[PDB]
Structure formats: C-alpha cells, structure tokens
Design a protein around this ligand. Structure first.
Ligand SMILES: OC[C@H]1O[C@@](CO)(O[C@H]2O[C@H](CO)[C@@H](O)[C@H](O)[C@H]2O)[C@@H](O)[C@@H]1O
Length: 628
C-alpha cells in the first residue's frame, strides 16, 4: 500500500516546477498535507479491507486524492474557518444549544427563494440546524419524494437553481443555522445518466449497478432479503423492459449502486465533495445499511458497508473537516448503534427512542422506554443521537424482540397491537393514522400520519396538545440533537388529498407530508388555539434547553419512579425529568423521592415543587426539576 507522502508528491506533479514551489508553501497545501498525514492511513485501511488487491484500487485512490486537493483548494475561505473550528471542537454536535428542524422546500415554502424568506421564522423558533429534503433533479410524477435522484448536480427546477441553493445555505449560516441535506448514495433513479449508460452497455459504466440476465441469482438473493416496500414489488429486484433484472431495494425506479466496484466509490466521493463545497454542514447518509451485498446474507449492515462509510468519513477529514454525517439506519437496535462513531457517522437517528415514545402513549406503560433509556442511550465520546418524534417516513416498531422478551413481551404480538391502535382499529384508540406497507407474508406493517393525527388532535381529543408537548419534551431533554418535524409545532394534520393523487395514492407516507398551513401558523401566538398552545409550549422548552447547561451533552441516568406510567431520568446529576404517559393523574411517592432535595424548581410550569411529599402529576404532565 502507498503512503501519504508518496501520493502527495504525485498530486503535485500536475504543476510546473515554478508553480509547485508556490503551492508547497501555500497555507491551503500545508493544511491539506497535515490532514493527509493524519487521516490517510484510515482511508487506505478502510478501502483495503473492502477492495483488497483490486487492480483499480491504486488508480482510483490517486484519482480521488487529486480530486480531493482541487476541491479543498477551491473551497471557500469561510468554510475553511468552519473546518478549523469543528476540527478542534468535535463535540459541537453534543451541545444543548443545538435544536434542528426538517422540511420539504416545496411543501413548506414553495421554492428556495421562498424558503430563504422563512429563515426569520426559523430563528424565531430557535433552530440552529435545518434539514432540507431532496432538492435535486428527479423523475417527474413518482420519485419517492425526491429520493430517486436523476442528477446530483442539477437542482429540481421547480425549486430553483444551484445558485439559489448556494444563497440559501449562505443565508442560513448568516442566521446561525447549519445546513443539512441528503446524501442519497445507495441508489440513483433509473433515469440517471449512469444508469442509462450502464444498462446501455457503455464500458465506462460497466458494473455501476447490479444487473442480472434472469431470475437465477435474484431468486437466490431473495431467499434472505427483507422487503422495504412490498407494495411495489417482491424481493429486492425489478425487471427491465429488455427482460434483465436489476437490484432495487426500494422502488423499481431506484437502482442500487454497485460499491463492489471501486469506481463507484470514487464517483460518489466526488459527489460528496461537490456537496461539501456548497457549504453543507451535515450530510444525511441515506440507507447506509444497504451499500454492500453478499449472497446468503440479509445484505444489510455488512462489514464492508461500515468500512465504506468510514472511508467516506476519512475523505471529509481530509478535504472538508466541517462536514459531519447523520446515519439513517432504521434497523435492529444492536445494528443501529454500530453506524455511530467519530470515525463513521458522528450522529444518527435514534429510531428506538422515537418508536418507544409512541409505544408508551398507546400502552401507558413506560417499561420498554425505561429499558431503552437505561441500556441503549449513552454513546461513545464525540457522537450523539438525533432524537425525533416524527419524520417524513412511516413509523416502524424497531424495538428489539430480545429486549421485549426480557420484559415478558412478545414482539410480534405487540407490534400487531401497536399497528392496530395507531390506525384506529382498536377500541378507544385516540390515534388516526394510516397503514403503510402491510406485508401479508410476514405480518409486518408501519404507520403513517402526523404527530397531531396520531395523538388525536384531528377529533379534538382534549389530551392531544399535552401528548405532543410530552413526546417532544423527551426528544428535547434526554441528550442528543433534537429534530422537529416542521409543521408539528402548530399541530398540523394529515394531507387530505394524497389518497386521490395518482402519483401518491399508493404511498400513504404522503398523508404526513402536508403543505404549510397558513391558518395554523397565523394562530401560533394565540394561547386559546391548539396551534398557539403547542407552539408556545415547544418554543418554551426549546428556550429552556438552549439556555440551561444542565441539558448539555448526551448522557443520562434513568431514575426509578416506582410508577409504571411515569418515566424518569436525570441529566448531568442536576436535572430530574418526569413524564406521565397516563391520561389519568399519576403519583410519584414521597418515599421514592427521599434522596432528592426538599424543594426543586420546575422549568416547565415555573413553579417550585415539594419533593418531601407525594408528587402527583396531571395527565401527560412533564416536569424538569432542577435538583442541582
Ligand atoms: O390505506 C389507505 C391506502 O394506503 C395505501 C397506500 O400506502 O396502502 C396502505 O394501506 C393498505 C390497506 O390498509 C395496505 O394493504 C397497504 O400495504 C398499505 O401500504 C393504499 O393502497 C390504500 O388505498
């Protein structure tokens, strides 16, 4: 294997002697050279574990590094300052000051210029992080909400131009808001040039995807492949018009990229640099679990997948230190955590917590949630969870069967219950969700619907508003970077048109992808409306979180409340949080509280509370007691 010094000398070989001398003394080169020495060993090691003695590895590597230098050289000075800042503050992601939001540019603000006009609102809300959904060119009609990319460089014309995106990102930074976008690296649309040329037989794009002559191998692979959208097609393959079959983990119009080919990594790494230089702060690593395939395995979470992401991580450490990764791994808890590491994905969605928040609202029992916060919350140094209540996707019950077994709970039976409850097919349910991907051959099913629709706000359940505050209070205080599904802060309901839109009717996820509700946002300052109540509540908690140091970091210690309906935890040994998931008053006995100070101030309600006597919480009430 070649070393950093060797490769760097060859990188400089493109310059004339006179030029070279100049570069070798430049500041940019000094920084690039230093990072090369520090991080290249990791990049080489990761790529070697995956590609081994592949003849294309060395050539691809040198091509990628030359590209990395040009990219870093061209990188804007202001971005380089951020590189230096984060390179020296790896825990910026763990700060209590961070609070994020996510929205579709078209649905929330019309277009990019329109989104720029919303920035003042984002500041009003207190956001320091904004994830904008898929912005680039995609097939018209059906594109999986933009996740079927036809071009990584050309902005969706309906949203604006690449120039508009640059301005948006610049304006976000001016507003103290990091920009977060998707890095859809597991697949492209079947209309992407690479796909067309690969399928057409262009030798330059040979093996850029997985294409088979017939069902022989597809049938063998399908013996162990999980179905993500069984509604769209069985197994993981789709048939071409010419009869061949291509790997399509998701929709038929989304073709899985072939990372067993070194040139594919190089291609995507080039796309990462492009995004990096636009000023992106965090890249949402879409479908990280699926980037490596191996006959006989589930083709998820394989070793090479992790190795590749660590390789990608190394490239940013070298050519754009400010760019961090957000892992999207909605899988088994044991698998979810493996993507999180300073050298892999510094942060990642925490589906376990999100899933259990909803579970607890249904069962009124915090057992599973307590278990999770107790044994699966804390993370390695320099990494953090992205805690959320809802997302652009359905809700999957990804808790661990093994964990549930410890508590005497049957995973399969429990999910059947949860599914029925949230789609209003259970007596007394307050939820008004919609089914998503019911798989007849497995019994699995997910749930679609907005936070408000799932808590009963559609029918005006008097407990709806409090349930929302409760769910969000936990994502906001357990430790990690909280993410607000923009629209939830005013109690936005489901979209009542998607079911009849032929481009959406077969994807119930559009039920919880409503447009900006002008009427609800116009009520956010009125305490008599649900929108105002929800808004002022969330805004208050956001304010408290960002200003109070007791919330800093991502570590927590659970507290036994001795009440199966009340969750309890302590942050920094100074903030004691209680959450009542029962629609009835619930009590934490004075006996249970004997070790606590006699009185404590509650940041939620603002009152001083007595802990030397039974503490009775109102239905769905949450308390943030300062115990130190
Ligand atoms: O249920 C309404 C509507 O949802 C769609 C689109 O996602 O399918 C979902 O619901 C069906 C019936 O409950 C499930 O069988 C299916 O698996 C699930 O995705 C539409 O097909 C249906 O009309």
């Amino acid at each position: 294997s070649p070393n950093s010094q060797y490769l760097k000398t060859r990188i400089l070989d493109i310059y004339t002697p006179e030029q070279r001398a100049g570069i070798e003394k430049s500041e940019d080169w000094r920084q690039f050279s230093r990072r090369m020495d520090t991080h290249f060993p990791k990049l080489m090691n990761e790529l070697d574990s995956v590609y081994g003695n592949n003849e294309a590895l060395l050539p691809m590597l040198e091509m990628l590094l030359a590209q990395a230098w040009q990219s870093y050289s061209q990188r804007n000075s202001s971005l380089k300052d951020i590189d230096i800042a984060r390179e020296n503050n790896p825990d910026w992601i763990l700060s209590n000051k961070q609070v994020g939001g996510v929205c579709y540019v078209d649905l929330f603000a019309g277009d990019l210029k329109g989104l720029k006009d919303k920035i003042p609102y984002f500041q009003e809300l207190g956001l320091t992080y904004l994830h904008l959904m898929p912005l680039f060119k995609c097939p018209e009609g059906k594109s999986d909400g933009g996740y079927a990319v036809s071009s990584y460089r050309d902005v969706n014309p309906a949203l604006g131009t690449i120039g508009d995106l640059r301005e948006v990102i610049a304006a976000l930074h001016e507003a103290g808001i990091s920009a977060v976008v998707d890095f859809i690296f597991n697949h492209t649309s079947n209309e992407h040039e690479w796909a067309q040329r690969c399928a057409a037989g262009d030798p330059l794009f040979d093996n850029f995807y997985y294409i088979f002559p017939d069902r022989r191998m597809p049938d063998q692979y399908d013996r162990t492949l999980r179905e993500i959208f069984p509604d769209q097609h069985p197994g993981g393959f789709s048939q071409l018009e010419d009869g061949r079959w291509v790997w399509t983990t998701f929709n038929s119009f989304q073709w899985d990229l072939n990372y067993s080919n070194p040139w594919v990594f190089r291609a995507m790494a080039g796309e990462m640099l492009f995004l990096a230089n636009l000023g992106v702060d965090i890249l949402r690593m879409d479908a990280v679990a699926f980037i490596w395939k191996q006959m006989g395995t589930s083709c998820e979470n394989l070793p090479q997948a992790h190795a590749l992401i660590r390789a990608f991580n190394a490239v940013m450490r070298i050519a754009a230190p400010a760019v961090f990764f957000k892992s999207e791994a909605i899988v088994h808890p044991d698998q979810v955590v493996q993507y999180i590491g300073q050298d892999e994905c510094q942060i990642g969605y925490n589906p376990l917590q999100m899933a259990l928040l909803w579970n607890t609202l249904a069962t009124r029992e915090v057992n599973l949630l307590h278990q999770a916060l107790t044994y699966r919350h804390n993370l390695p140094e320099h990494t953090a969870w992205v805690n959320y209540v809802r997302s652009h996707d359905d809700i999957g019950w990804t808790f661990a069967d093994e964990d549930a077994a410890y508590l005497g709970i049957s995973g399969y039976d429990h999910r059947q219950f949860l599914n029925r409850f949230f789609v209003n097919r259970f007596d007394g349910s307050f939820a008004r969700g919609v089914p998503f991907q019911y798989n007849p051959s497995t019994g699995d099913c997910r749930v679609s619907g907005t936070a408000a629709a799932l808590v009963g706000l559609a029918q005006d359940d008097p407990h709806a508003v409090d349930r929302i505050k409760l769910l969000y209070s936990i994502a906001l205080s357990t430790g990690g970077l909280p993410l607000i599904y923009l629209g939830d802060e005013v109690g936005t309901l489901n979209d009542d048109d998607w079911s009849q839109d032929s481009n959406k009717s077969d994807d119930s996820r559009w039920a919880h992808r409503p447009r900006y509700n002008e009427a609800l946002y116009a009520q956010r300052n009125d305490p008599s409306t649900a929108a105002g109540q929800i808004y002022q509540d969330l805004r208050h908690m956001i304010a408290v979180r960002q200003s109070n140091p007791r919330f800093d970091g991502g570590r927590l210690v659970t507290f036994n409340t001795n009440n199966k309906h009340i969750i309890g935890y302590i942050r920094n040994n100074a903030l004691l949080a209680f959450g009542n998931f029962s629609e009835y008053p619930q009590t934490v006995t004075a006996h249970t509280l004997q070790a606590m100070p006699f009185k404590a101030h509650d940041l939620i309600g603002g009152k001083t509370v007595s802990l030397n006597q039974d503490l009775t919480l109102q239905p769905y009430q949450v308390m943030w007691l300062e115990i130190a």
